[PDB]
């Protein structure tokens, strides 16, 4: 079946995790703590160096969005046809370039990075905005009337930036609207209310 | 058909370049000059203020990535099955892990960060020779038998990291053989060496 291998953390694999959860999947969580990773047999064995580490069956993945295309590719979260495949890329490649800023203002800048971070904020999240604007005026999902992989990961890049800037959807209804209704899904409001979800920090560094 | 929308450099738009004419597909360069860019019509159009910019017939996409998995998909360099395309995934996404590296190095930190990044390179390119040897003994291409987008990719970035670093391939026989047979392709051949490619700059700050 499906096993998720990472740090006590949302991180990386939050978006996936929703995924799965939200489409019925069962999967298995292989939880590594930072003494067996810093023992250093994990890490070598993995491709880059780094986790997740995903498997499904005999097949191991690596990469974050390599785990999420996968999924969508199998699941049928990946756009009707190569037009809509093309724009869930357009939308995964750049929550991705924005949860690279995030992810280095968490780790590297925080303290000094976080204002000039937020004030950057609107224009980064500006793009997703427009794109719902264009498709069914925001009432459905990111690209087409199906859920895909995007969605996810553009849901938890939204859901975390709510915590480091509270309020930042305030400005773009759409955005606020679609995070309501994707966290409303029967399915995903359960997982996200879950132990399993809230009880794990969103970075492992203690700040967001 | 299609256009490709950028600034008069290499850059992230190598690779796609070198699929599109390996692959024997005709395409518009339309050139975008520093002015241009500061004059901000175009940038306030783009999705996310960036290019490349793509068009392929009425489909205008944003993501250099993006753009690379709709040219392997429509192509038919995604694998020949699901797996395949996972793996395909997990070596680009690698693949831009580094690139994002080397794209910070080059813009932002050259002088002082150079012998740091060559120190950590061979690290760095292990996983690609590692993939290689266990595809056929990396005889033929980076996932499966058949060329993907990945390929191209992973080429443009070894390509670029030998001019970073003279001889950085010179601890992976099978990535030096790879980037030998692969620049040797015929229609691949005729573009590295034309006019097109060979005088336009790798970056666009004069540093490589
Ligand atoms: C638990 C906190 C940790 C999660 S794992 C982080 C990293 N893996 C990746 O970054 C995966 C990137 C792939 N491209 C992908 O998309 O999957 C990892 O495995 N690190 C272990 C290693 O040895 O490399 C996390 O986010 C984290 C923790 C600590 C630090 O450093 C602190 C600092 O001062 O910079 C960072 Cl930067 C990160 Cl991202
Ligand atoms: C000509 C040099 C320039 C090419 S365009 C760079 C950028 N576009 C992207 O980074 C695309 C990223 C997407 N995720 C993708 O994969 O396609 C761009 O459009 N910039 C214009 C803008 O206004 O944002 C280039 O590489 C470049 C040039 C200058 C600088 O800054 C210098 C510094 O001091 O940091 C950088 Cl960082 C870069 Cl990357």
């Known amino acids: 079946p499906y096993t998720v291998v990472y740090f006590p953390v949302r991180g990386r694999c939050a978006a996936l995790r929703m995924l799965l959860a939200d489409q019925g999947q069962s999967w298995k969580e292989e939880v590594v703590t930072v003494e067996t990773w810093q023992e ?5 064995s993995c491709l880059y160096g780094q986790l997740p580490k995903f498997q499904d069956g005999d097949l191991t993945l690596y990469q974050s969005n390599t785990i999420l295309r996968h999924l969508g590719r199998t699941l049928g979260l990946y756009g009707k046809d190569q037009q809509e495949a093309a724009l869930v890329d357009m939308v ?15 780790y590297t800048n925080y303290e000094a990075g976080k204002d000039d971070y937020v004030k950057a904020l ?3 999240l500006k793009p997703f905005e427009t794109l719902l604007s264009q498709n069914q005026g925001g009432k459905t999902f990111i690209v ?18 709510e915590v480091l800037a509270p ?6 209804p759409l955005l606020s609207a679609y995070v309501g209704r994707l966290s409303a899904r029967p399915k995903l409001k359960a ?7 809230v009880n ?6 203690g700040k967001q």
């Not at 995007?150 to 938890?156: E, I, K, P």
Request: hydrophobic share 40%; glycine share 10%.
């Open 167 to 172: 309020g930042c959807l305030d400005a773009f």
């Open 200 to 205: 794990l920090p969103i970075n492992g560094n």
């Open 92 to 106: 995964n490649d750049g929550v991705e370039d924005l949860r690279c800023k995030y992810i280095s203002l968490i």
């Open 122 to 124: 609107p224009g980064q």
């Open 144 to 161: 087409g009337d199906q859920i895909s992989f995007a969605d996810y990961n553009l849901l938890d890049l939204l859901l975390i930036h």
């Open 191 to 197: 997982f996200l209310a879950s132990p399993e979800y």
């Open 40 to 44: 250093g047999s994990l890490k070598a």
